[PDB]
Design a protein around this nucleic acid. Structure first.
Ligand SMILES: [Mg+2]
Ligand SMILES: [Mg+2]
Ligand SMILES: [Mg+2]
Ligand SMILES: [Mg+2]
Ligand SMILES: [Mg+2]
Ligand SMILES: [Mg+2]
Ligand SMILES: [Mg+2]
Ligand SMILES: [Mg+2]
Ligand SMILES: [Mg+2]
Ligand SMILES: [Mg+2]
Ligand SMILES: [Mg+2]
Ligand SMILES: [Mg+2]
Ligand SMILES: [Mg+2]
Ligand SMILES: [Mg+2]
Ligand SMILES: [Mg+2]
Ligand SMILES: [Mg+2]
Ligand SMILES: [Mg+2]
Ligand SMILES: [Mg+2]
Ligand SMILES: [Mg+2]
Ligand SMILES: [Mg+2]
Ligand SMILES: [Mg+2]
Ligand SMILES: [Mg+2]
Ligand SMILES: [Mg+2]
Ligand SMILES: [Mg+2]
Ligand SMILES: [Mg+2]
Ligand SMILES: [Mg+2]
Ligand SMILES: [Mg+2]
Ligand SMILES: [Mg+2]
Ligand SMILES: [Mg+2]
Ligand SMILES: [Mg+2]
Ligand SMILES: [Mg+2]
Ligand SMILES: [Mg+2]
Ligand SMILES: [Mg+2]
Ligand SMILES: [Mg+2]
Ligand SMILES: [Mg+2]
Ligand SMILES: [Mg+2]
Ligand SMILES: [Mg+2]
Ligand SMILES: [Mg+2]
Ligand SMILES: [Mg+2]
Ligand SMILES: [Mg+2]
Ligand SMILES: [Mg+2]
Ligand SMILES: [Mg+2]
Ligand SMILES: [Mg+2]
Ligand SMILES: [Mg+2]
Ligand SMILES: [Mg+2]
Ligand SMILES: [Mg+2]
Ligand SMILES: [Mg+2]
Ligand SMILES: [Mg+2]
Ligand SMILES: [Mg+2]
Ligand SMILES: [Mg+2]
Ligand SMILES: [Mg+2]
Ligand SMILES: [Mg+2]
Ligand SMILES: [Mg+2]
Ligand SMILES: [Mg+2]
Ligand SMILES: [Mg+2]
Ligand SMILES: [Mg+2]
Ligand SMILES: [Mg+2]
Ligand SMILES: [Mg+2]
Ligand SMILES: [Mg+2]
Ligand SMILES: [Mg+2]
Ligand SMILES: [Mg+2]
Ligand SMILES: [Mg+2]
Ligand SMILES: [Mg+2]
Ligand SMILES: [Mg+2]
Ligand SMILES: [Mg+2]
Ligand SMILES: [Mg+2]
Ligand SMILES: [Mg+2]
Ligand SMILES: [Mg+2]
Ligand SMILES: [Mg+2]
Ligand SMILES: [Mg+2]
Ligand SMILES: [Mg+2]
Ligand SMILES: [Mg+2]
Ligand SMILES: [Mg+2]
Ligand SMILES: [Mg+2]
Ligand SMILES: [Mg+2]
Ligand SMILES: [Mg+2]
Ligand SMILES: [Mg+2]
Ligand SMILES: [Mg+2]
Ligand SMILES: [Zn+2]
Lengths: 50, 100, 77, 112, 91
RNA sequence: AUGGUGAACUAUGCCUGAAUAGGGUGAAGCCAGAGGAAACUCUGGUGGAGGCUCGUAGCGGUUCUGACGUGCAAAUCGAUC
RNA sequence: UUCAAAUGAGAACUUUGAAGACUGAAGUGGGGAAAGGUUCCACGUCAACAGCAGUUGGACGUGGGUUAGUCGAUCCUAAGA
RNA sequence: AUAUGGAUUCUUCACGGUAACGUAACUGAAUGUGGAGACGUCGGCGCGAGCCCUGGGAGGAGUUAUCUUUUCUUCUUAACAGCUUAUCACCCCGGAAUUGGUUUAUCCGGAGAUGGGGUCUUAUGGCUGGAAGAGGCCAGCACCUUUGCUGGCUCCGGUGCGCUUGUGACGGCCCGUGAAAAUCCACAGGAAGGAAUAGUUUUCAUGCCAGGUCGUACUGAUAACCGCAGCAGGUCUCCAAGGUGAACAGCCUCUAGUUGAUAGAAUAAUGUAGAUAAGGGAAGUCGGCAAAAUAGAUCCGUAACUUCGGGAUAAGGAUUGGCUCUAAGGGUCGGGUACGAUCAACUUAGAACUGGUACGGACAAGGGGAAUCUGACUGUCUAAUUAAAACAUAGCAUUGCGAUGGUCAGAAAGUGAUGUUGACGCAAU
């Protein structure tokens, strides 16, 4: 890093949008079943493997 | 090649407030100013006077304004007048004693 | 980035088609050793270089400043 | 006491990464990167730095009035003049001898 | 004042390699570093520069030569043999 | 047994880069001088040689059969080297 | 390591002032390559996490932030492919 | 993209200089050729920059029982541009034994020295432009504010085996002689095009438009990377202050940064880590394991043996602080065609005095000696129980091979290694 390829900037940027908690309004829909976000990620817990 | 330099200090502002005695003060200069290495040897090479409200020094021997600030700091400390008065250059070589 | 000395070449610079603006500068300085004197630099700004003409004589400067094209944008000091 | 940092992302000490410490109007020390040095062009005959010709890294020779890249003589900016001297002399003399070689063996054939 | 009874330039090698070997080198080293007479301009300025190559200080001529010395004993006989044989062809 | 995946560790070659306080020794070459009938021999300098030497960084890993041995650590830590 | 203040339900651990020390320019200073990918900064803020703690954080919530004719890439060729 | 100015031409494609060469310009197709890109390492020596040290002056700060014309600190100048600046190299004059010139380092000259006079490279530096308007340091007024507002000063020098880096002219080394291409210029060439009623000229000046795409945060580590982790491990590099000292050592400091690592009370046994111990001195033990001893520098003094290079710091000795003096060692100038004047350095030897005989006063820093065995040496390996006498090595010797070949690769092949090779070679022991 520190001087990256646009391919990698993307995945990096895509991964930044996926790093939010559940939108709580979803919690309210009929039959809704998703308690929490089970696909979250931390920079110092799981590495992206590029 | 010889040169004769002058040094003015406006001692008014603390003189008027009583806590300053341009008398014994110019006297401090007059015999603790070092002249090729010792006191008193002001041998018509340097002069100290007072204009009642102003001190004057004129030199022909090695004497810098940094020296003149060193001495009065010492006088001002010898008589407890620190906290109350500062030595300050107003204009180049024109000094004074600021009170407040 | 360029210095000038010909006080005729100077004048013609200030009448160049691209020379929009110019500025006049005043430094107090000193002479030989004894005393001071008032210096004056005449900077003209071309599309690709700032020509500046130092005139060390106070007199020559006062006459020069009037020679300036009245359509020129002068920045005094 | 005042230290200094490279001004480019390259952190290593290479020929294209030479530094030069400098005092700015700010009163601070600062690195400045320094282009590699120019070397003098040379005589393609004798091999010396060929005099009268200016020296700058190669592409900089295209930003220069033609006089900086030449001297005003036969084979000017290209050979060292004492080289030109030589190849004039040898030219003349060998062209001459060519005459002495011909008419001489023109006699051989006639006296044989 | 003389510094070494015998080892000469070979004195860099200290105590190592065995005397005999230093001798063999020294002989050849003295040959290679030595300064030689130029056939062409006549000054003793021919000095070596990597095995086989011999070049004149001034006048800048370069002769191909022996590995450690300028003229191989062999090569020089050869120079003469060719002399001889050549001669036959005109006369 | 069949078909695949590895030289990010490591082994070796190539290509292109980078790195190494201060000391000791004093090899060729060079200058001046001394003796001697001669052949030749000596002295003082200068100079800066080496898979040379003292020793940091570096690289290594000798001993304590030291620490630790449910560790800081699936090989580390200390001193010594 | 210490005294105080401030903050807070709560302060051995946060902020600030004071004191004592440390690294000692071969750095515990100032920057970068590889690698990470937002950790950078601000505001909010402690359920879990930081093997005592917590009002603090590389944690949590929510936002903001990376500007180039000249710095790199891009072009060149190296071993090789 | 181009337009004006200048330069050039009735001798069409410039002049000047004896010459090295000069310059604001001063046409040039194919084609060829030359240079630059472009190159090892070490050594000393020369110079540059930044740093270090330091005098005077102007400021601000610190200490002041006492002492110190004191301690600390500010005083700066970018790219780019003009002029000027060089060791080297070269030109002109001239003609050399009584040989001279000359580096720290011994090279140079009748293939033209020493001498005089010139020419070039612009590394580098100087002064001016940029540029004081910036920046830096102060004082003197204002007020919740945005935050101003007004004045000043920013000057002149010194030193060098200093440190770091840059660089030049040289020297050593090699069976090692230490990339390539893109790219830019030059020259040889002369096809061609081009003037007097007006042409040629954009390598001289000035002028106009344009410059996309992707990366740009931060960590870089005793918490941002890899070791299941905020792991005492691992992980490529630049910058680098003062003292002491030989020093980028250790030890203390400035600047900057930390003050992170659960805490409290006690100090039993046994520990881990750091120390001392009377008399004796290895009697301990497989074994002096561990520990102790030694140590710098100056001087003196040094054996067998030896491949003559070493062995060697052999061994063995003495000395060392503070302070106060003496002597030696240098630079710069004017001398008709003997000396005078000043400036700025730590080295080295000596001599006094001095102390609870101490002084490399901490830090730092070799134990020596006589043999046997074994490997010549330096070098290498079992990452994680073996570093050795084991491997390598130069040296010695043997073998194969002249290319329709030796040796070796492949399933094959219009295939491949040695081979950019040729017996002073490659291959195999
Ligand atoms: Mg950067
Ligand atoms: Mg290098
Ligand atoms: Mg590059
Ligand atoms: Mg020229
Ligand atoms: Mg020129
Ligand atoms: Mg690899
Ligand atoms: Mg060294
Ligand atoms: Mg030593
Ligand atoms: Mg050494
Ligand atoms: Mg005699
Ligand atoms: Mg040496
Ligand atoms: Mg060695
Ligand atoms: Mg050693
Ligand atoms: Mg040492
Ligand atoms: Mg180590
Ligand atoms: Mg090793
Ligand atoms: Mg160990
Ligand atoms: Mg153990
Ligand atoms: Mg245990
Ligand atoms: Mg060691
Ligand atoms: Mg604490
Ligand atoms: Mg605190
Ligand atoms: Mg300390
Ligand atoms: Mg250190
Ligand atoms: Mg830390
Ligand atoms: Mg990261
Ligand atoms: Mg975010
Ligand atoms: Mg943060
Ligand atoms: Mg909690
Ligand atoms: Mg955590
Ligand atoms: Mg906890
Ligand atoms: Mg808790
Ligand atoms: Mg967040
Ligand atoms: Mg560039
Ligand atoms: Mg591109
Ligand atoms: Mg002309
Ligand atoms: Mg070419
Ligand atoms: Mg070439
Ligand atoms: Mg290269
Ligand atoms: Mg300073
Ligand atoms: Mg530039
Ligand atoms: Mg001359
Ligand atoms: Mg002349
Ligand atoms: Mg010297
Ligand atoms: Mg370095
Ligand atoms: Mg060479
Ligand atoms: Mg060229
Ligand atoms: Mg042009
Ligand atoms: Mg395009
Ligand atoms: Mg950045
Ligand atoms: Mg950073
Ligand atoms: Mg960190
Ligand atoms: Mg990790
Ligand atoms: Mg993982
Ligand atoms: Mg760790
Ligand atoms: Mg930090
Ligand atoms: Mg702990
Ligand atoms: Mg405890
Ligand atoms: Mg005892
Ligand atoms: Mg005893
Ligand atoms: Mg005994
Ligand atoms: Mg026993
Ligand atoms: Mg035994
Ligand atoms: Mg026994
Ligand atoms: Mg032991
Ligand atoms: Mg003892
Ligand atoms: Mg023996
Ligand atoms: Mg011995
Ligand atoms: Mg004494
Ligand atoms: Mg003297
Ligand atoms: Mg004198
Ligand atoms: Mg061995
Ligand atoms: Mg092992
Ligand atoms: Mg194993
Ligand atoms: Mg070993
Ligand atoms: Mg072992
Ligand atoms: Mg043998
Ligand atoms: Mg076939
Ligand atoms: Zn010759």
């Amino acid at each position: 890093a520190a001087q990256k390829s646009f391919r990698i900037k993307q995945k990096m940027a895509k991964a930044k949008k996926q790093n939010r908690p559940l939108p709580q309004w979803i919690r309210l829909r009929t039959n809704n079943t998703i308690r929490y976000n089970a696909k979250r990620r931390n920079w110092r817990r799981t590495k992206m493997n590029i | 090649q010889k040169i004769a330099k002058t040094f003015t200090v406006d001692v008014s502002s603390p003189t008027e407030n009583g806590v300053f005695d341009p008398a014994s003060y110019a006297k401090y200069l007059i015999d603790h100013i070092k002249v090729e290495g010792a006191v008193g040897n002001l041998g018509n090479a340097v002069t100290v006077t007072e204009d009642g409200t102003v001190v004057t020094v004129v030199s022909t021997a090695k004497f810098s304004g940094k020296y003149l600030k060193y001495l009065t700091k010492k006088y001002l400390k010898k008589n407890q007048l620190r906290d109350w008065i500062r030595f300050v250059s107003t204009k180049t070589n024109e000094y004074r004693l600021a009170f407040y | 980035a360029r210095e000038i000395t010909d006080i005729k070449q100077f004048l013609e610079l200030t009448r160049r088609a691209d020379v929009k603006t110019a500025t006049v500068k005043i430094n107090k300085k000193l002479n030989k050793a004894g005393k001071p004197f008032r210096q004056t630099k005449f900077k003209v700004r071309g599309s690709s270089s700032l020509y500046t003409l130092v005139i060390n004589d106070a007199g020559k400067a006062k006459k020069l400043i009037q020679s300036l094209p009245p359509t020129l944008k002068v920045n005094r000091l | 006491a005042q230290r200094v940092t490279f001004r480019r992302r390259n952190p290593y000490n290479t020929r294209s990464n030479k530094i030069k410490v400098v005092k700015t109007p700010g009163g601070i020390l600062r690195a400045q990167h320094v282009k590699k040095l120019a070397t003098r062009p040379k005589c393609g005959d004798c091999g010396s730095a060929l005099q009268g010709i200016s020296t700058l890294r190669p592409r900089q020779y295209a930003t220069v009035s033609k006089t900086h890249k030449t001297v005003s003589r036969a084979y000017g900016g290209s050979r060292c003049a004492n080289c030109v001297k030589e190849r004039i002399i040898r030219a003349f003399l060998i062209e001459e001898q060519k005459i002495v070689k011909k008419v001489v063996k023109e006699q051989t054939e006639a006296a044989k | 004042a003389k510094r070494t009874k015998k080892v000469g330039i070979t004195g860099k090698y200290g105590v190592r390699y065995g005397s005999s070997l230093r001798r063999q080198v020294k002989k050849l080293e003295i040959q290679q570093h030595a300064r030689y007479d130029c056939s062409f301009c006549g000054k003793k300025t021919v000095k070596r520069g990597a095995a086989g190559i011999w070049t004149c200080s001034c006048c800048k001529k370069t002769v191909a030569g022996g590995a450690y010395t300028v003229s191989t004993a062999a090569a020089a006989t050869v120079r003469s043999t060719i002399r001889r044989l050549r001669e036959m062809v005109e006369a």
